[PDB]
Amino acid sequence: ASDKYQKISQLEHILKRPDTYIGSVETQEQLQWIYDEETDCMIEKNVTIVPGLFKIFDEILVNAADNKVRDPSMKRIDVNIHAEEHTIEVKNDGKGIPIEIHNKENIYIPEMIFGHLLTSSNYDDDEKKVTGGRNGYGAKLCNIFSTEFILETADLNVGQKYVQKWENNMSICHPPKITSYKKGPSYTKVTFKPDLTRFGMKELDNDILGVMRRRVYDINGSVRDINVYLNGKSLKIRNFKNYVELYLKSLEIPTILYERINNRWEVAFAVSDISFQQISFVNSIATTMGGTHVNYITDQIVKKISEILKKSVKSFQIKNNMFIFINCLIENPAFTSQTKEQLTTRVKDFGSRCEIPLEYINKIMKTDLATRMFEIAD
Amino acid sequence: SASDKYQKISQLEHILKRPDTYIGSVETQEQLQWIYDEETDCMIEKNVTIVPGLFKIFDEILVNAADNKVRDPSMKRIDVNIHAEEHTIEVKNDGKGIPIEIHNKENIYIPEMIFGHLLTSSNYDDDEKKVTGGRNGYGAKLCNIFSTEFILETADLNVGQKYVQKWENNMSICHPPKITSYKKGPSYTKVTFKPDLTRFGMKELDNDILGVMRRRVYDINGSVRDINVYLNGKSLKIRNFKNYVELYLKSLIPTILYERINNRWEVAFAVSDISFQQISFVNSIATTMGGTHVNYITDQIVKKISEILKKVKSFQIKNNMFIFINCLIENPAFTSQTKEQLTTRVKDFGSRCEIPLEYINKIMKTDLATRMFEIADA
Ligand SMILES: Nc1ncnc2c1ncn2[C@@H]1O[C@H](COP(=O)(O)OP(=O)(O)NP(=O)(O)O)[C@@H](O)[C@H]1O
Ligand SMILES: Nc1ncnc2c1ncn2[C@@H]1O[C@H](COP(=O)(O)OP(=O)(O)NP(=O)(O)O)[C@@H](O)[C@H]1O
Ligand SMILES: [Mg+2]
Ligand SMILES: [Mg+2]
């Protein structure tokens, strides 16, 4: 009976069952937005991508964005994708990783938080934080799903440079090379080579490159006060309104209605062609499966439109003519999984509210939505 | 401070600190839930306030018992006894028990191993295509971890012994098993737990959680073939999925249209009053957030209706449907440990489910058709 039952390690379970950590490691046929460089705008495309591969990139991206929360003096993210060499680099400025041996773990802190599961600066929820990072997995998950993983950082308090290489799904950990550093700014650079074989791929194809690239545009659109560079090119999205307007050409009384509701909430609206559509971000994370924040906003808009039509029309008819954009900040958010695709935090625990002004719903009532809704009623 | 800022925690510590991706929220949630009304012998939808994590730890034990029918098709009986006043919950199943044997690798008794250590399972070899609900080797331990007291009792006829082992204080206390001679009796497994109500923000099991727990036991009777289920000694009476779906009749040409499509798929249909509704089961797991199996079935029905209608938008057809699905899926994958949403691709199901024209024609005899013709004319 012994063979019937097995005990496995945390690390073994991640490699065996990637789904709850990074999403599927199988190819998925998806309708995805990508940024078209020739038309300088968003295009919806049928792609085939491996979610887990996109997600290990996303983990490093959101970590960089989180450092802007930790250090508001940070000014730039650099993303460099070397397709041919399957190598991806993510660099941020502002404060680096402290080059110190940890009191308890007795290893260098960078080795600790990039090379050991369940390590985080986000474990003390006494503090209400608007970082995306929550559970102490993201960076290690990337490491685990890489043939090679390199952490480079510079710390000004100690005046040192720190380079550490992991290999073979985080199973090989080389000692760090630490050198002297009085060379300008602090920074962190993460350089990884995904285990493409683990994702059933031989190379980075145009589909995955397209969505990776677009995700970088997302970061620029959702995070304020940073410059975002992709393969050397400054993306120069000035704000979330500018980001949403990248979708303008494809969608085509304004086509997009944008409003900043408060310091933690921005929303945009457009009329949807076939069914309900949403693009939303919580603390820079792309909530592709929506959740409590999306529902909080849409419910308000649908509720009011229903009242207007009443003085015949079911709520679903209203909702399915809506394309909503949301950029929001939520305190200590909770999600259905590590992939953080769906927010579960109750509204009352958001740390803020977003009461959509009646005048904004009035503007929605001038769009094609109302004409469609008055045809069903009358 | 840097040592205080960055923390390493154990897997056990993480589960208790951050329950969400393991068992769901430990905060109260307002939910619309189906309840079994005993006075009117039917399902009724009620607004309830429950703690999802508490409901979930109960569900893990229920699904484990259901899984034993796959292991041993001769299993006939599940008893669920809720002693509200004592907040003790018991789940007992007959058929083959847990082997009372020292594991050849782990060097401890198998029950101690698979109920008292994380990441232990008989479901880690996916070379076998199984239709068990169990996948990750967490479920039983999660219940234990969120219990003040957790008792496994089992009888094993191969060694002719009975085994009783008690854990206390969130699995932190593991008492040695009591093993006794057991001759001339049936095999069985009985799990008895007292949920750590302090960790769920509760003092007692109120009517809302009891109602939802009891309904979940009806689900099990409805979804598991050829078993008899009891709640506090009282037979649940239903024998199959058709019977189960019929419990919803009073709330909902027949009102409900049911068909077994094959040995792994049953589907029932009713006209929905407000919007799209689904009740679905994968390997006896309640997939309350739907997923690929639900989409597979509904896409077909929608596509087939749409083709006949034009001889209207897809969401208009979809949202007049109430779909019931009971299916068996090979080695399923889900968004999280809570298994609310199936992600397995259709091609990986291990079977197919083509909805026949006869079934579609019968749907076209219901209110859905005349509602669609109303939209078509205008
Ligand atoms: N670019 C960066 N700059 C500074 N600190 C970083 C950076 N990336 C990661 N860290 C630190 O490393 C820790 C581990 O990162 P990570 O593994 O992604 O976990 P996390 O972000 O805290 N939580 P999660 O991403 O939800 O699993 C983080 O808590 C940060 O404190
Ligand atoms: N009532 C039962 N009868 C027989 N075997 C059981 C029973 N309950 C649990 N087990 C066994 O104990 C193991 C551990 O259970 P569990 O922790 O729930 O993991 P799992 O069911 O395999 N996977 P998961 O529930 O998805 O985390 C299972 O693999 C079963 O083999
Ligand atoms: Mg992170
Ligand atoms: Mg289980």
Positive or negative: CA dihedral A288, A293, A296, A302: negative
Cβ atoms B196, B22 nearer than 8 A: no
- Phi/psi region, residue B2 (left: phi>0; alpha: psi -120 to 50; beta: rest), is alpha
- Alpha carbons B231 and B246: distance in angstroms, whole number: 19
Taking the C-alpha atoms of residue A173 and residue A107, their distance in angstroms, rounded to an integer, is 12
Domain B9-252, what fold?
A: Heat Shock Protein 90 (3.30.565)
Residue A186 zone, left/alpha/beta (φ > 0; ψ -120 to 50; rest): beta
Whether A140 and A61 have beta carbons less than 8 Å apart is answered as no
Could B6 and A102 be called an inter-chain contact, meaning their C-beta atoms sit closer than 8 Å? yes
Q: How far is the CA of B121 from the centre of ligand 2 (A)?
A: 6
Calculate how far, in angstroms, residue A210's C-alpha sits from the geometric centre of ligand 1: 25
- B353 vs B286, B325, B328, CA distance in Å? 19, 11, 11
Distance in angstroms (rounded) separating the CA atoms of residues B101 and A92: 55
Method: X-ray
Give the nearest partner residue to B27 out of A20, A274, A346, using CB atoms.
A346
Please state, as a whole number, how many other Cβ atoms lie within 10 Å of the Cβ of residue A213.
Answer: 18
Joined together, the tokens standing for residue A363 give: 């503007």
Rg (alpha carbons) of chain B, rounded to whole number: 22
- Cβ of B21 within 8 Å of Cβ of A112? The answer is no
Nearest CA to ligand 2 atom 15: B140
C-alpha B158 chain-centroid distance: 30
CA-wise closest residue to B224 among B34, B73, B334, B331: B73
- Strand A172-173 versus strand A160-167 pairing type: antiparallel
Is B153 touching ligand 2 by the criterion CB < 6 Å? no
A20: chain B residues, CB-CB within 8 Å: 21, 136, 334-337
Residue type present at position B49: T
Which fold does the domain A8-251 belong to in CATH? Heat Shock Protein 90 (3.30.565)
Where exactly are the structural domains of chain A? 8-251, 256-378
What angle do the packed helices B367-377 and B292-309 form, to 10 degrees? 60
Looking only at Cα atoms, what is the longest distance across chain B?
76
Of A217, A211, A204, the closest CA to residue A88 belongs to A204
Ligand 1: centre distance to CA A278 (Å): 27
DSSP, collapsed to helix, strand or coil, labels residue B218 as helix
The dotted CATH code for A256-378 is 3.30.230.10
CB-based contacts of B275, cutoff 8 Å, min separation 6:
A314, A315, A316, B319
Q: For residue A99, which of A90, A108, A91, A107 has the smallest C-alpha distance? A: A108
**B125 to chain A: which residues are within 8 Å by CB?**
6
d(CA A23, CA A131): 21
Cβ-contact B148, B196 below 8 angstroms:
yes
Q: How is residue A320 written in tokens?
A: 């399915």
Contact A77, A226 (CB under 8 A): yes
A302 CA to centre of own chain: 27
Q: Which residues line ligand 1 (CB under 6 A)?
A: A 59, 63-64, 67, 92, 97, 113, 119-122, 133-140, 188
Residue B41 is given by DSSP the state: T
**CA angle A140–A143–A149, rounded 5-degree value:** 135
Handedness of CA B190, B196, B201, B202 (dihedral sign): positive
Please count the helices (runs of H) and the strands (runs of E) in chain B. 12, 18
What is the distance between the terminal CA atoms of chain A, rounded to a whole angstrom? Answer: 69
The closest alpha carbon to B261, from B190, B327, B175, belongs to B327
Residue among A207, A235, A232 at smallest CA distance from A222: A235
Mutation probe of ligand 2 site: the residue of B22, B67, B229, B337 with most atoms within 8 A of C-beta? B67
d(CA B213, CA B230): 13
d(CA B122, CA B136) in angstroms, rounded, equals 9
Are the CB atoms for B281 and B339 separated by under 8 Å? no
Helix A368-377, helix A292-310: angle, nearest 10: 50
For residues B154 and B163, give the distance between their C-alpha atoms in angstroms, rounded to a whole number.
5
- Residue B374 three-state SS: helix
**Overall residue count recorded for chain B in this entry:** 378
Q: How far is A2 from chain B (nearest CA, A)?
A: 5
Token reading at A362 = 């009035």
- In terms of Cα–Cα distance, which of A272, A274, A273, A292 is closest to A282? A292
CA distances from B329 to A195, B63, B223, B244 (A): 29, 15, 13, 20
Angle at A316 between CA A315 and CA A319, to 5 degrees: 90
Closest ligand 1 atom, residue A340 Cα? 26
CA of residue B210 relative to chain centroid, distance: 16
The pair of structure tokens assigned to B192 is 């008895």
> B207-223 and B52-71 are packed helices; what angle lies between their axes, rounded to 10 degrees?
20
Residue with the two structure tokens 């474990």: A123
* Closest by Cα among A265, A269, A272, A263 to A301: A269
Output the DSSP codes for B322-351: EEEEEE--SS--BSSTT--SB---GGGSSS
Nearest to A279 by CA among A271, A290, A270: A290
d(CA A231, CA A208): 16
> How far is residue B273's CA from residue A230's CA, in Å, rounded to a whole number?
50
Residue A30: what residue type? Q
Structure tokens at B234: 């009282």
H/E element, B244: helix B241-246
Same CATH fold, B256-378 and B9-252? no
Yes or no, beta carbons of A2 and B101 under 8 Å apart: yes
- Region of residue A236 (left: phi > 0; alpha: psi -120 to 50; beta: else): left
Residues with Cβ within 5 Å of ion ligand 4? Answer: B 64, 134, 139
Q: Does any ligand 2 atom lie closer than 6 A to the CB of residue B135?
A: yes
**Is residue A230 a contact partner of residue A71, using CB atoms and an 8 Å limit?**
no
* Integer angstrom CA distances of residue B204 from A90, A107, B38, B257: 50, 46, 22, 40
Separation of alpha carbons A78 and A86, rounded Å? 17
B122–A5 C-beta distance less than 8 A: yes
Chain B residue closest in CA terms to A274: B313
Q: Which residues of B are annotated as a binding site?
A: 64, 93, 121-123, 134-141, 337-339
- The token duo for A254 is 């304004």
- Which of B197, B115, B99, B195 shows the shortest CA–CA distance to B152? B115
* Residues A287-292: contacts with CB under 8 Å, at least 24 apart: A287/A340, A287/A341, A287/A342, A287/A343, A288/A341, A289/A336, A289/A341, A289/A342, A289/B335, A290/A342, A290/A343, A291/A335, A291/A336, A291/A342, A291/A343, A291/A344, A292/A343, A292/A344, A292/A345, A292/A346, A292/A347
Hey, are the CB atoms on B110 and A320 less than 8 Å from each other?
A: no
The two structure tokens encoding residue B322: 């109430």
Residue with the nearest Cα to atom 18 of ligand 1?
A138
Residue in A20, A118, A349 nearest the CB of B337 = A20
What B260-265 contacts at long range (C-beta under 8 Å, 24+ apart), as own/partner pairs, is B261/B353, B261/B354, B261/B355, B261/B356, B262/B351, B262/B353, B263/B328, B264/B131, B264/B327, B264/B328, B264/B329, B264/B350, B264/B351, B264/B353, B265/B325, B265/B326, B265/B327, B265/B328, B265/B351, B265/B353
> Does ligand 2 lie within 6 Å of residue B336's CB atom?
no
- Read off the amino acid at residue B146: F
B357: helix, coil or strand?
Answer: helix
> Which helix (H) or strand (E) is B139 found in, with range?
helix B139-145
Ligand 1 atom 3, closest CA: A67
The tokens of B34 are what?
């189906």
Per-residue CA distances from B331 to A50, B135, B281 (Å)? 19, 7, 14
Nearest CA to ligand 2 atom 19: B137
For residue B98, give the chain A residue with the closest CA: A1
Query: Residue A107 burial (CB < 10 Å; 0-12/13-18/19+)?
Result: middle
Contacts of A10 in chain B (CB under 8 A): 11, 119
Q: Let me know: does A76 contact A228? Beta carbons within 8 Å.
A: yes
Contact (CB, 8 A) for B341 and B291: yes
CA–CA gap between residue B276 and residue B323 (Å, rounded):
8
Ligand index nearest the alpha carbon of residue A62: 3
CA atoms within 13 A on the CB side of A52: 28
Question: Cα distance from B218 to chain A (closest Cα, Å)?
Answer: 26
- Distance between CA atoms of residues A96 and A162, nearest Å: 10
Three-class secondary structure assignment of chain A = CHHHCEECCHHHHHHHCCHHHHCCCCCEEEEEEEEECCCCEEEEEEEEECHHHHHHHHHHHHHHHHHHHHCCCCCEEEEEEEHHHCEEEEEEECCCCCCCECCCCCCEHHHHHHHCCCEECCCCCCCCCCCCCCCCCHHHHHHHCEEEEEEEEEECCCCEEEEEEEECCCCEECCCEEEECCCCCCEEEEEEEECHHHHCCCCCCHHHHHHHHHHHHHHHHHCCCCEEEECCEECCCCCHHHHHHHHHHHHCCCCCEEEEEECCEEEEEEECCCCCEEEEEECCEECCCCEHHHHHHHHHHHHHHHHHHHCCCCHHHHHCCEEEEEEECCCCCCECCCCCCCECCCHHHCCCCCCCCHHHHHHHCCCHHHHHHHHHHC
Backbone φ and ψ for A173, nearest 5 degrees, come out as -125, 105
CA distances from B157 to B104, B115, B166 (A): 20, 20, 21
Cα-to-chain-centroid distance, residue A1: 45
What is the C-alpha separation between B210 and B202, in angstroms, rounded?
13
Phi, psi of A98 (to 5 degrees): -50, 120
Question: Could you count the other beta carbons within 10 Å of the beta carbon of residue A315?
Answer: 16
Cβ-based neighbours of A45, under 8 Å, separated by 6 or more = A31, A32, A33, A34, A210
**Cβ contacts (< 8 Å) between B338 and chain A: which residues?**
336
Query: Are A294 and A341 spatial neighbours (Cβ–Cβ below 8 Å)?
Result: no
Cβ-based burial of B1 (10 A; exposed 0-12, middle 13-18, buried ≥19) = exposed
Of the CA atoms within 13 Å of residue A360, those in its CB half-sphere come to 21
Where does chain A break, by residue before each gap (C–N > 2.5 Å)?
252, 311
